[PDB]
Amino acid sequence: HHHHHDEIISELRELCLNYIEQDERLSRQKLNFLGQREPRMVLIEGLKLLSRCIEIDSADKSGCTHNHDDKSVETILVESGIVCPGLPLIIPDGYKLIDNSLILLECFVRSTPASFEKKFIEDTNKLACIREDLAVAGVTLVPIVDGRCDYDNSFMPEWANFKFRDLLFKLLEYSNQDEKVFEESEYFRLCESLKTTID
Amino acid sequence: HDEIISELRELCLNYIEQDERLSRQKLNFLGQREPRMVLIEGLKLLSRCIEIDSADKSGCTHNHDDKSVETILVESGIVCPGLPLIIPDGYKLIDNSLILLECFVRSTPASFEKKFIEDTNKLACIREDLAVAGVTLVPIVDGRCDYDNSFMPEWANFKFRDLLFKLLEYSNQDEKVFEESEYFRLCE
Ligand SMILES: [Mg+2]
Ligand SMILES: [Mg+2]
């Protein structure tokens, strides 16, 4: 056809344009993904695009607002006239305030039972350790941890999701040769000689 | 053809500032393959830039979702049914006054004045039914003479329009030199 890497990139863009549902909360990340032309960058922003699908998909199913702009909890409450300072820097995947209860959502994907459970406890405990600062605000914390075992989500048909991840794999397991060829360049050796001059 | 669609793609991606209000329209534009659709979305995209500048100059919110006056009010708690389907380029409900913004581009004084009166009458004919509901209409018509907007350098703005223009003149294909020579010759 062929499939030399620039055509992989091309097929990823067609998948993004033809088979990722046109939800406004993906517009920004779709645009950042379509804007890339270097292979490791296309790979990075493709992975970030697929993660936004899962996070937003999670926020919808959990009945709160996807944290579109990665606000902190302190920011979410400071945005609603509720002064709570002295709280960890926590950025939830979703949130929703009612009337004095604050739903906070963390979601994730793990592929083995051991890592699933371990991750579930970690995010449970991350949310639990601010329950009391919120109590003196005084707002009730409603922690939600949404663990998933795969990458299915409602903005991608399953076949396109799989083909997208499959092209991403070919893109990584290829640009894992361009950086290896890079380590024999000279510009690599000239980088190597660049640090010794500053460090 | 394709190199025109390709360099248009790169202007959109690299030389239109990444204000998120443009994101959706940029993406509809980037998804078009055929000249006709590239042209309409191209023009819509230039218009969105201009509407968004107007909203920002006029102190009101850009009508991103193409909401209706009907909708804008019910979202602020004003039940006022029976209004014609009017969809502004901008809006801002403020106390009990509804700022409605109509934004446009024209390039001759004659067609500028015409389109100005039209958008004036467009909003004015819902003034009374807003007064029934309490809200006083604040109608703003902002007409422009060109496509200058704050999201593109001027050279890019010109190159985009020059590229869209060549799609427009391409849509020709002689064609009319064979009209009756088979077409107007069917129900004959
Ligand atoms: Mg309009
Ligand atoms: Mg208008």
Author numbering:
A (entry chain B): -4 to 194
B (entry chain A): 0 to 187
Q: What does the original paper state about this entry?
A:
The synthesis of mRNA in arenaviruses is a process that is primed by capped nucleotides that are ‘stolen’ from the cellular mRNA by the endonuclease domain in cooperation with other domains of the L protein. The L protein cleaves and snatches the native cellular mRNA cap structure through its endonuclease domain after ∼11 nucleotides, and uses it as a primer sequence for the RdRp domain of the L protein to synthesize the viral mRNA. The catalytic centre of the ENDO resides in the N-terminal part around Asp88 and should contain two Mg2+ (or Mn2+) ions, which are critical for the RNA-cleavage mechanism.
Therefore, for this structural study to be successful it was critical to search for new crystallization conditions that would allow the molecules to form ionic complexes. The present ENDO-WT structure clearly shows the two Mg2+ ions directly coordinated by the catalytic Asp88 and, through a network of water molecules, by Glu101 and Lys114. Together, these data indicate that the affinity of the Arenaviridae endonuclease for its catalytic ions is low and that the metal-ion binding at the catalytic site is the result of a random event in the absence of an RNA substrate. In the ENDO-WT structure, the water molecules mimic the positions of the nonbridged O atoms of the RNA phosphodiester backbone involved in binding to the ions. Therefore, we propose that in the case of the LCMV endonuclease domain the RNA substrate is a necessary contributor to the formation of a transitioning ion-binding/catalytic site that allows a two-metal-ion catalytic mechanism (TMIC). This suggests that the catalytic ions responsible for the two-metal-ion catalysis reaction are most likely brought in by the RNA substrate itself.
